[PDB]
Ligand binder design. Structure first.
Ligand SMILES: *[C@@H]1O[C@H](CO)[C@@H](O[C@@H]2O[C@H](CO)[C@@H](O)[C@H](O)[C@H]2NC(C)=O)[C@H](O)[C@H]1NC(C)=O
Lengths: 183, 215, 215
């Protein structure tokens, strides 16, 4: 059977800037059981119908996964902009697939702050769709070169969410799985 | 040095348009999160608009559809195009750079006034000392537009005890302010008191002698 | 939507004092908080970001603390250049760039009751169609003061405006002017015009008045 258990129920998720991609192929999947689950706060499909998912046949299936803030989940959708969509994980305008998300405060928040999850704050240009940038070069916000040294106008490009369980929901961590279909 | 220099502020009628500019030195506008923040007279700070290095733009709900932020990388300059302006848009406008949403570099501000009023010099009325040992007298500088008005007493020789109050905007769209001075009551018979009012926008200069109301 | 509040709105302190301003978030925001200092007519100045990180170039007597919903700006030993308004700001907020409403820190001094003066409208202004009655509260502390206009002992609401000076450089007091505006016809319908002032330095409210048409 298709290995959705090891994507959705994985112990640790990736940082959004270093989002993970799992290829799903040569297996049988009951997509309807996912849709029927009450655990997901977001289940939005684009170019397909969730109910008629099981009937369909796909060339290739990709499952991308990462963690972001609740207030940023609306950026994981075609045609959206924002620090996440622009500089971390970009869906194409012609996306065919589903975006699945759920609150993971009990898993990914920690008293005192969990700082393992990061996002890219600084990038000169927007990401192309399904582009993944994992560089950690110092970002040059002025005309003087940084030469690997953080300082004025010389910024480390990644920032930590630092999730705390007392956060308001928009600041809480959400686990996201993006199913994209070649179809 | 590092600085943001704003220009373009001025007077506009409601419904009108105005374009602000912010010329940067010491940072690259196109590779930064650049914002406009405004402050209406006597009020707090209100963020207006931001432009990202990658080009995305966002606006406060209060200006969406009317304002557009932009930049010219060749001139290293940030712009705010304001259309269909309203009186509530009257404010000092700042441009600013943010790092992780903290604004560390700010411009000096440029003032934007949105009003249907026309330029008009003030009427100056005496605030006459009471007939009934310190006495107060003054000048009421009423119904002028636009700000500012300057007031002196006895051509600058009288400074101690003077209070010139902030102007207030009246329901009519015109400004009014008062300037008062306290003096020894014994000096009301011996010393002349003249308030000198200057309103440069209308090229109005007024000298008003203030004396006790006769009886 | 998360609401940022600041307590107290107004604070009086002396040089050398320890000052703590608080900023509150209706929901948990971890350490997503910055603090700014602003002086009148100047751009804000970034003091603190990430709740506790001191901005470079900012004196060490400024420190920030807190995480979640309760945040504090502390000035360990107040200096003369610290009298200003202080704003907190929620970082990475939705909607963006939510500011707190500000805390104004002014110079503490002993209570000083105001000197109250009332001015009738000038004959010149009455020639035209309106009457401005002015009440002056001079050199008082603290800033909190109440002015109640009365016309033949009918309490007046909606036809007056106030303005206040910034606290004086020599004696740290305030002055306040209130203006009651009436049409000439309404002015002539009544006799007794009175300004009733309430202030901490006054044991009971003080009233200054005049009778229309009397020397
Ligand atoms: C991930 O784990 C959860 C918890 O074990 C699974 O949720 C239950 O799964 C069983 C099947 O083993 C169902 O009978 C229950 O109805 C599920 N409960 C809920 C609340 O959904 C979940 O199915 C697992 N997900 C995957 C993709 O394997």
């Amino acid at each position: 059977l298709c290995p959705f258990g090891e994507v959705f129920n994985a112990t640790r998720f990736a940082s959004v800037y270093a989002w993970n991609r799992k290829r799903i192929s040569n297996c049988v999947a009951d997509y309807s059981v996912l849709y029927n689950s009450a655990s997901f706060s977001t289940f939005k499909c684009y170019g397909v119908s969730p109910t008629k998912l099981n009937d369909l046949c796909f060339t290739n299936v990709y499952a991308d996964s990462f963690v972001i803030r609740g207030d940023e989940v609306r950026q994981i959708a075609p045609g959206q902009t924002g620090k996440i969509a622009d500089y971390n994980y970009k869906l194409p305008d012609d996306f065919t697939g589903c975006v699945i998300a759920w609150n993971s405060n009990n898993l990914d928040s920690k008293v005192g702050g969990n700082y393992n999850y990061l996002y890219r704050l600084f990038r000169k240009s927007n990401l192309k769709p399904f582009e993944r940038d994992i560089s950690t070069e110092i970002y040059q916000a002025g005309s003087t070169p940084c030469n690997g040294v953080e300082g004025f106008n010389c910024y480390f490009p990644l920032q930590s969410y630092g999730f705390q369980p007392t956060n308001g929901v928009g600041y809480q961590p959400y686990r996201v799985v993006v199913l994209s279909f070649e179809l | 040095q590092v600085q943001l220099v704003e220009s373009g502020g001025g007077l506009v009628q409601p419904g009108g348009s105005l374009r602000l500019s912010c010329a940067a030195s010491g940072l690259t506008v196109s590779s930064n999160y650049m914002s406009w923040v405004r402050q209406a007279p006597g009020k707090g700070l209100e963020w207006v608009s931001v432009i990202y290095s990658g080009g995305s733009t966002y606006y406060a709900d209060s200006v969406k559809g009317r304002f557009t932020i932009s930049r010219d990388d060749s001139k290293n300059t940030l712009y705010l195009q304001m259309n269909s302006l309203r009186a509530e848009d009257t404010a000092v406008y700042y441009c600013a750079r943010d790092v992780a949403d903290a604004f560390d570099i700010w411009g000096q501000g440029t003032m934007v006034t949105v009003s249907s009023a026309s330029t008009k010099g003030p009427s100056v009325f005496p605030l006459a000392p009471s007939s009934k040992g310190t006495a107060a007298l003054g000048c009421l500088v009423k119904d002028y537009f636009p700000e500012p008005v300057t007031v002196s007493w006895n051509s600058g020789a009288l400074t101690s005890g003077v209070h010139t109050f902030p102007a207030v905007l009246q329901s009519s769209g015109l400004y009014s302010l008062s300037s008062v001075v306290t003096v020894p009551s014994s000096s009301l018979g011996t010393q002349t008191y003249i308030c000198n009012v200057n309103h440069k926008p209308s090229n109005t200069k007024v000298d008003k002698k203030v004396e006790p109301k006769s009886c | 939507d998360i609401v940022m509040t600041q307590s107290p709105s107004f604070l009086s302190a002396s040089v050398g004092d320890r000052v703590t301003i608080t900023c509150r978030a209706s929901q948990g925001i971890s350490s997503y908080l910055a603090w700014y200092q602003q002086k009148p007519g100047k751009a804000p100045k970034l003091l603190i970001y990430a709740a506790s990180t001191l901005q470079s170039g900012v004196p060490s007597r400024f420190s920030g603390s807190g995480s979640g919903t309760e945040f504090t700006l502390t000035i360990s030993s107040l200096q003369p250049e610290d009298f200003a308004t202080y704003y907190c700001q929620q970082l990475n907020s939705y909607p963006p760039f939510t500011f707190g409403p500000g805390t104004k820190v002014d110079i503490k001094r002993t209570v000083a009751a105001p000197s109250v003066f009332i001015f009738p409208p000038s004959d010149e202004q009455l020639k035209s169609g309106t009457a401005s009655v002015v009440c002056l509260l001079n050199n008082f502390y603290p800033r909190e003061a109440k002015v109640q206009w009365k016309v033949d002992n009918a309490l007046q609401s909606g036809n007056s405006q106030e303005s206040v000076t910034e606290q004086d450089s020599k004696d740290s007091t305030y002055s306040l002017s209130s203006t009651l505006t009436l049409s000439k016809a309404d002015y002539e319908k009544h006799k007794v015009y009175a300004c009733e002032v309430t202030h901490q330095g006054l044991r009971s409210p003080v009233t200054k008045s005049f009778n229309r048409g009397e020397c």
